[PDB]
Amino acid sequence: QGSHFMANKRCQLPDGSFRRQRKGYEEVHVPALKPKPFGSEEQLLPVEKLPKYAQAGFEGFKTLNRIQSKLYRAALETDENLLLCAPTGAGKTNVALMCMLREI
Amino acid sequence: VSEMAVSELPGNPNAVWTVRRHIEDEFDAYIIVSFVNATLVLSIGETVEEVTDSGFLGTTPTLSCSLLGDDALVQVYPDGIRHIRADKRVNEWKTPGKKTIVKCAVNQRQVVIALTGGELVYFEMDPSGQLNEYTERKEMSADVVCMSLANVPPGEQRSRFLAVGLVDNTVRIISLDPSDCLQPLSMQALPAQPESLCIVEMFLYLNIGLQNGVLLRTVLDPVTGDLSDTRTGSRPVKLFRVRMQGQEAVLAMSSRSWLSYSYQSRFHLTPLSYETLEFASGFASEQCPEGIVAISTNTLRILALEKLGAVFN
Amino acid sequence: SFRPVPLEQTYVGITEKKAIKRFQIMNEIVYEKIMEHAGKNQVLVFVHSRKETGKTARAIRDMCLEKDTLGLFLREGSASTEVLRTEAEQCKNLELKDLLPYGFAIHHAGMTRVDRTLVEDLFADKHIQVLVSTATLAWGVNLPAHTVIIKGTQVYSPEKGRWTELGALDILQMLGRAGRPQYDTKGEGILITSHGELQYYLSLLNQQ
């Protein structure tokens, strides 16, 4: 049962989570997560203040999404390899796209 | 009209807000009395008394102070657009040029902010909590005299569409989610220029008000549902949403303080037993569990409105 | 916390073994979860087959219709919420029609070629309050939901020849569509599952 093995035997609940007891079936009520608190001078990137050359193909985007803007400098400026750790909804495709504009 | 408390104020009052500082707040927190000159800001001190420290420092009248971030208050005034958090920070935009923001309104996220010449903006608060400004800021042909964002249903953060006023004596309806921004969704003709366009539920019913006291209710959907009308003193239709008795309704004023509301889904347009008015909106506290901050002729008031299933008091 | 839509998760398992009664209890959890969504929302259900997309659909029809049209009519009223478009686009490729006159719909690649296209863009045009569909329809184009629900999490693997807990990449893929970057704010994510793999399903809702 690989990828369903769950080699970890004990799990950790999120912040506002609890267990609700129903008639023979259980529910886990799990609160949602909050984005990181805004740091000073912590600014996302526009597609203008990223590479002027790779500004091609960027039709349909105005300013870089938070994770792509947090990763783009290193993602493009050198052949330094990347390992991204994030959950769905960020556009990790857009970080790999900067890493590929590096090769571009 | 019942008295929780009433007081006078000097000078020229032009607006007033009532804000919280978190969704948990059982009481509204920050009453922002917007003079024509500055803003007397107070968190209710049980004898409500003056407050500078609020983090508001209003040096101009108010056009919004709003809880849209849970810990955040956005305060936009004729000078600038201040983003405020539990850290009562001022991450501020400043209205392009020396021009000044005129007509604005609040969502759960978005902030309608409308400047002279028809230059609108579009906000939306980032994954983060701090807000992002949609790159375009659209021109409008005529004077947008009012527009209200539809307060978004729980699980989402955005409207389905929104209405827009214009001075040509009609009304525009514009959607603002990435579905269509800067597309005129649907309009309707008005027998006079708009003055106030606020929304009601219980389904979604629009209320239009003209500058001469007349108002109209409608069904709210991608196109106008149906205009039902009444004539209420040739004076500005002041329109407001405020809860009552387990449900929300509209306050309106042209020459009376009219509660227009759904009595078990029943549109009644009931006067309230008080002389002419200046400005009002909802309020809560211990001294006033549910009432109206009604700032009136040279006067400011915390009022209570008793039995609302009846016709004659 | 870098995921776009704050994902509040009901990870509810069934703990019983009983199979003929489980095929009712799970349907009951479905009934209540759609009673939770029957207001202003979009409910996107994920299942592990093709015909289940339209078989759980029209069962919601039996539900809202044995509710004596109470809980049905997800709109404000009759001409409300584009009933004209709902009736005007009536005849279609597959048996979608029998439901589509009402507020229930499905998704899969099977029905036709452009059928899943016209269902996903239909939901993006703010008229499809409830859609039930398959793992391919979630893997495909970004058709998000105000709230999504994985139902059962049980797949029949021809590679394993027998029952398998569905893959984890599909989990993340269909869970990033419970709540959107634009269309939905605070994602509601329902996982109806086995109360054995339940705690594993919380370790999967986390980064453990």
Side-chain angles (χ1 to χ4, degrees), chain A residues 2 7 14 16 24 31-32 35 37 39 46 51 54 56-57 60 74-75 86-87 89-91 96, chain B residues 1-155 157 159-313, chain C residues 4 6 13 19 38-39 54 57 59 71 77 79 88 101 103 105 109-110 124 135 138 140 144-145 152 158 161 167-168 176 178-179 181 187 189 196:
Chain B
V1 278
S2 162
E3 320 79 8
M4 305 284 202
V6 170
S7 309
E8 185 141 14
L9 200 58
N12 324 61
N14 260 359
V16 147
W17 262 247
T18 32
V19 206
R20 274 171 195 101
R21 228 273 296 138
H22 229 318
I23 303 210
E24 77 86 23
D25 213 7
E26 71 291 74
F27 300 154
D28 240 11
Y30 276 87
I31 323 106
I32 348 280
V33 179
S34 100
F35 288 113
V36 292
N37 313 138
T39 346
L40 191 94
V41 187
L42 284 66
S43 197
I44 168 170
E46 296 326 89
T47 322
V48 200
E49 239 21 75
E50 321 313 275
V51 177
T52 38
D53 49 65
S54 74
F56 282 1
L57 292 324
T59 50
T60 325
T62 304
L63 315 165
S64 168
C65 325
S66 89
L67 55 152
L68 54 218
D70 321 272
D71 6 306
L73 303 94
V74 172
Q75 171 167 96
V76 54
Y77 31 87
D79 310 70
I81 329 170
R82 179 189 321 208
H83 150 281
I84 272 229
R85 187 59 57 158
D87 310 273
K88 265 152 158 199
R89 298 171 275 178
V90 177
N91 183 320
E92 183 229 317
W93 279 283
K94 179 126 272 163
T95 89
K98 199 39 142 314
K99 334 166 191 196
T100 241
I101 241 127
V102 183
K103 308 257 187 302
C104 94
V106 187
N107 239 334
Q108 206 277 336
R109 275 170 89 154
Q110 298 62 17
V111 175
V112 128
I113 31 177
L115 170 96
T116 192
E119 175 83 331
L120 192 105
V121 207
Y122 191 89
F123 280 175
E124 262 198 301
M125 33 223 63
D126 208 271
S128 265
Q130 225 283 301
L131 326 334
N132 278 44
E133 219 178 18
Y134 176 93
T135 327
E136 210 273 356
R137 299 95 144 73
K138 195 175 202 187
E139 309 67 79
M140 265 299 85
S141 101
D143 174 287
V144 157
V145 75
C146 186
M147 62 189 289
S148 156
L149 249 310
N151 315 30
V152 39
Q157 254 147 9
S159 80
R160 183 23 189 113
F161 23 78
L162 121 115
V164 186
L166 59 164
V167 84
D168 84 328
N169 283 207
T170 81
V171 151
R172 290 251 62 82
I173 277 63
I174 257 235
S175 161
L176 61 161
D177 328 14
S179 208
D180 275 323
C181 193
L182 320 190
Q183 168 220 99
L185 182 105
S186 77
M187 78 112 21
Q188 59 260 45
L190 305 198
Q193 204 238 333
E195 171 121 9
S196 311
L197 324 183
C198 277
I199 259 61
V200 205
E201 174 218 44
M202 218 73 248
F203 261 85
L204 190 75
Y205 300 102
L206 135 87
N207 261 242
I208 313 114
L210 332 184
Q211 66 265 15
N212 310 318
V214 188
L215 79 95
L216 307 70
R217 17 195 173 208
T218 332
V219 130
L220 215 289
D221 212 68
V223 177
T224 179
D226 154 66
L227 270 306
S228 55
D229 57 300
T230 162
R231 143 81 181 168
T232 78
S234 163
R235 248 80 40 73
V237 164
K238 291 151 290 292
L239 218 53
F240 321 92
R241 258 72 117 294
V242 30
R243 46 147 163 191
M244 194 62 180
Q245 295 304 86
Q247 174 135 55
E248 193 156 359
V250 181
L251 191 287
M253 210 287 172
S254 297
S255 309
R256 267 136 303 292
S257 83
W258 296 86
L259 155 82
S260 166
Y261 81 109
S262 35
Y263 172 73
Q264 227 75 350
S265 101
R266 212 47 57 171
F267 283 171
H268 196 180
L269 167 65
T270 93
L272 272 284
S273 193
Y274 188 75
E275 60 264 53
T276 164
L277 262 205
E278 260 308 342
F279 188 119
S281 266
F283 187 66
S285 173
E286 179 31 78
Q287 207 74 300
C288 162
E290 320 206 12
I292 294 320
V293 165
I295 73 102
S296 8
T297 58
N298 309 49
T299 35
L300 275 50
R301 315 189 192 235
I302 306 313
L303 293 165
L305 307 169
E306 263 61 80
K307 307 340 162 283
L308 271 181
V311 202
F312 299 66
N313 68 145

Coordinates of all heavy atoms in Angstrom, one line a residue, chain A residues 3-4 6 8 10-12 24-36 86-90, chain C residues 1-4 6-16 165 168 172 176 199-200 202-203 206 208, unseen atoms left out:
Chain A
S3 N 2.3 4.8 -0.8 CA 1.6 6.1 -0.9 C 0.3 6.1 -0.1 O -0.3 7.2 0.0 CB 1.4 6.5 -2.4
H4 N -0.1 5.0 0.4 CA -1.1 4.8 1.4 C -0.6 4.1 2.6 O -1.4 3.8 3.5 CB -2.4 4.2 0.8
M6 N 1.4 5.3 4.9 CA 1.5 6.2 6.0 C 2.4 5.6 7.1 O 1.9 5.3 8.2 CB 0.0 6.5 6.6
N8 N 4.2 7.0 9.0 CA 4.0 7.7 10.3 C 2.7 7.2 11.0 O 1.6 7.2 10.4 CB 3.8 9.2 10.0
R10 N 1.4 8.2 14.0 CA 0.6 9.2 14.7 C 0.7 10.5 14.0 O 1.8 10.9 13.5 CB 1.2 9.3 16.2
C11 N -0.5 11.2 13.9 CA -0.6 12.4 13.2 C -0.7 13.6 14.1 O -1.0 13.4 15.3 CB -1.8 12.3 12.2
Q12 N -0.5 14.8 13.6 CA -0.7 16.0 14.4 C -1.8 16.8 13.8 O -1.9 17.1 12.6 CB 0.6 16.8 14.3
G24 N -21.9 5.9 14.7 CA -21.1 4.9 14.0 C -20.1 5.5 13.0 O -19.3 4.7 12.5
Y25 N -20.1 6.8 12.8 CA -19.1 7.4 11.9 C -18.6 8.7 12.5 O -19.4 9.4 13.1 CB -19.8 7.7 10.5
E26 N -17.3 8.9 12.4 CA -16.6 10.0 13.0 C -16.3 11.1 12.1 O -16.1 10.8 10.9 CB -15.4 9.5 13.8
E27 N -16.2 12.3 12.5 CA -15.8 13.5 11.7 C -14.7 14.2 12.4 O -14.7 14.3 13.6 CB -17.0 14.4 11.5
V28 N -13.7 14.6 11.6 CA -12.6 15.5 12.1 C -12.9 16.9 11.5 O -12.8 17.1 10.3 CB -11.2 15.0 11.7
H29 N -13.2 17.8 12.4 CA -13.4 19.2 12.1 C -12.1 20.0 12.2 O -11.5 20.1 13.3 CB -14.5 19.9 13.0
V30 N -11.6 20.4 11.0 CA -10.3 21.0 11.0 C -10.3 22.4 10.5 O -10.8 22.7 9.4 CB -9.4 20.1 10.0
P31 N -9.9 23.4 11.3 CA -9.9 24.8 10.8 C -8.9 25.0 9.7 O -8.0 24.2 9.5 CB -9.5 25.5 12.1
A32 N -9.0 26.1 9.0 CA -8.2 26.4 7.9 C -7.0 27.2 8.3 O -6.9 27.8 9.4 CB -9.0 27.2 6.8
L33 N -6.0 27.2 7.4 CA -4.7 27.8 7.7 C -4.7 29.3 7.2 O -5.4 29.7 6.3 CB -3.5 27.1 7.0
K34 N -3.8 30.1 7.9 CA -3.7 31.5 7.7 C -2.4 31.8 7.0 O -1.4 31.4 7.4 CB -3.9 32.3 9.0
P35 N -2.4 32.7 5.9 CA -1.1 33.0 5.3 C -0.1 33.7 6.2 O -0.5 34.3 7.3 CB -1.6 34.0 4.2
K36 N 1.1 33.6 5.9 CA 2.2 34.1 6.8 C 2.0 35.6 7.0 O 1.5 36.3 6.2 CB 3.6 33.8 6.1
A86 N 5.8 23.2 -0.8 CA 4.6 24.0 -0.7 C 3.3 23.2 -0.9 O 3.4 22.1 -1.5 CB 4.6 25.3 -1.6
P87 N 2.2 23.8 -0.5 CA 0.9 23.1 -0.8 C 0.3 23.7 -2.1 O 0.6 24.8 -2.6 CB 0.0 23.3 0.4
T88 N -0.7 22.9 -2.7 CA -1.4 23.3 -3.9 C -2.0 24.6 -3.7 O -2.5 25.0 -2.7 CB -2.4 22.2 -4.3
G89 N -2.0 25.4 -4.8 CA -2.6 26.7 -4.8 C -1.6 27.9 -4.9 O -2.1 29.0 -4.9
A90 N -0.3 27.6 -5.1 CA 0.7 28.6 -5.2 C 1.1 28.9 -6.6 O 1.5 30.1 -6.9 CB 1.9 28.3 -4.4
Chain C
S1 N 0.1 27.0 4.7 CA -0.4 28.4 4.8 C -0.1 29.2 3.5 O -0.5 30.4 3.4 CB 0.3 29.1 6.0
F2 N 0.7 28.6 2.6 CA 0.9 29.2 1.2 C -0.1 28.7 0.2 O -0.2 29.2 -0.9 CB 2.3 28.8 0.7
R3 N -1.0 27.8 0.6 CA -2.1 27.4 -0.2 C -3.1 28.5 -0.4 O -3.3 29.3 0.6 CB -2.8 26.2 0.4
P4 N -3.6 28.8 -1.6 CA -4.5 30.0 -1.8 C -5.7 30.1 -0.9 O -5.8 31.0 -0.1 CB -4.9 29.9 -3.3
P6 N -7.9 29.2 2.2 CA -7.8 28.5 3.5 C -8.7 27.3 3.6 O -10.0 27.4 3.6 CB -8.2 29.6 4.5
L7 N -8.1 26.1 3.7 CA -8.8 24.9 3.5 C -9.3 24.3 4.9 O -8.5 23.7 5.6 CB -8.0 23.9 2.8
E8 N -10.5 24.5 5.3 CA -11.2 23.9 6.4 C -11.7 22.6 6.0 O -12.5 22.5 5.1 CB -12.3 24.8 7.0
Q9 N -11.3 21.5 6.7 CA -11.5 20.1 6.3 C -12.4 19.4 7.3 O -12.1 19.3 8.5 CB -10.1 19.4 6.2
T10 N -13.5 18.8 6.8 CA -14.2 17.8 7.5 C -13.7 16.5 6.9 O -14.1 16.1 5.8 CB -15.7 17.9 7.3
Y11 N -12.9 15.8 7.7 CA -12.4 14.4 7.3 C -13.2 13.4 8.1 O -12.9 13.1 9.3 CB -10.9 14.3 7.6
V12 N -14.3 13.0 7.6 CA -15.3 12.1 8.3 C -15.1 10.7 7.7 O -15.3 10.5 6.5 CB -16.7 12.7 8.2
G13 N -14.8 9.8 8.5 CA -14.8 8.4 8.1 C -16.1 7.6 8.6 O -16.7 8.1 9.6
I14 N -16.4 6.6 7.9 CA -17.3 5.6 8.4 C -16.5 4.5 9.1 O -15.5 4.0 8.5 CB -18.2 5.0 7.3
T15 N -16.9 4.0 10.3 CA -16.2 3.0 11.0 C -16.7 1.6 11.0 O -16.1 0.7 11.4 CB -16.1 3.5 12.5
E16 N -17.9 1.5 10.4 CA -18.5 0.1 10.4 C -18.0 -0.7 9.2 O -17.4 -0.2 8.3 CB -20.1 0.3 10.3
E165 N -6.9 2.3 -1.3 CA -7.1 3.7 -1.0 C -6.5 4.6 -2.2 O -5.4 4.3 -2.6 CB -6.4 4.1 0.3
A168 N -2.3 9.6 -3.5 CA -2.1 10.8 -2.8 C -2.0 12.1 -3.7 O -2.4 13.2 -3.3 CB -0.9 10.7 -1.8
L172 N -4.2 15.5 -3.3 CA -3.7 16.9 -3.4 C -4.4 17.6 -4.6 O -4.8 18.8 -4.4 CB -2.2 17.0 -3.5
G176 N -6.9 20.8 -3.9 CA -6.6 22.2 -4.3 C -7.8 22.8 -5.1 O -7.7 24.0 -5.4
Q199 N -7.0 8.6 10.5 CA -5.9 9.4 11.1 C -4.8 9.6 10.0 O -4.1 10.7 10.0 CB -5.3 8.7 12.3
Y200 N -4.6 8.6 9.1 CA -3.7 8.8 8.0 C -4.2 10.0 7.1 O -3.4 10.7 6.5 CB -3.5 7.5 7.2
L202 N -5.7 12.6 8.2 CA -5.3 13.8 8.8 C -3.8 14.1 8.7 O -3.4 15.3 8.4 CB -5.7 13.8 10.3
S203 N -3.0 13.1 8.8 CA -1.6 13.2 8.5 C -1.4 13.7 7.0 O -0.3 14.2 6.7 CB -0.8 11.9 8.8
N206 N -2.2 17.3 6.7 CA -1.0 18.0 7.2 C 0.2 17.6 6.4 O 0.2 16.8 5.5 CB -0.8 17.8 8.7
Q208 N 3.0 15.8 7.5 CA 3.6 14.9 8.4 C 4.4 13.8 7.8 O 5.2 13.1 8.5 CB 2.6 14.4 9.4

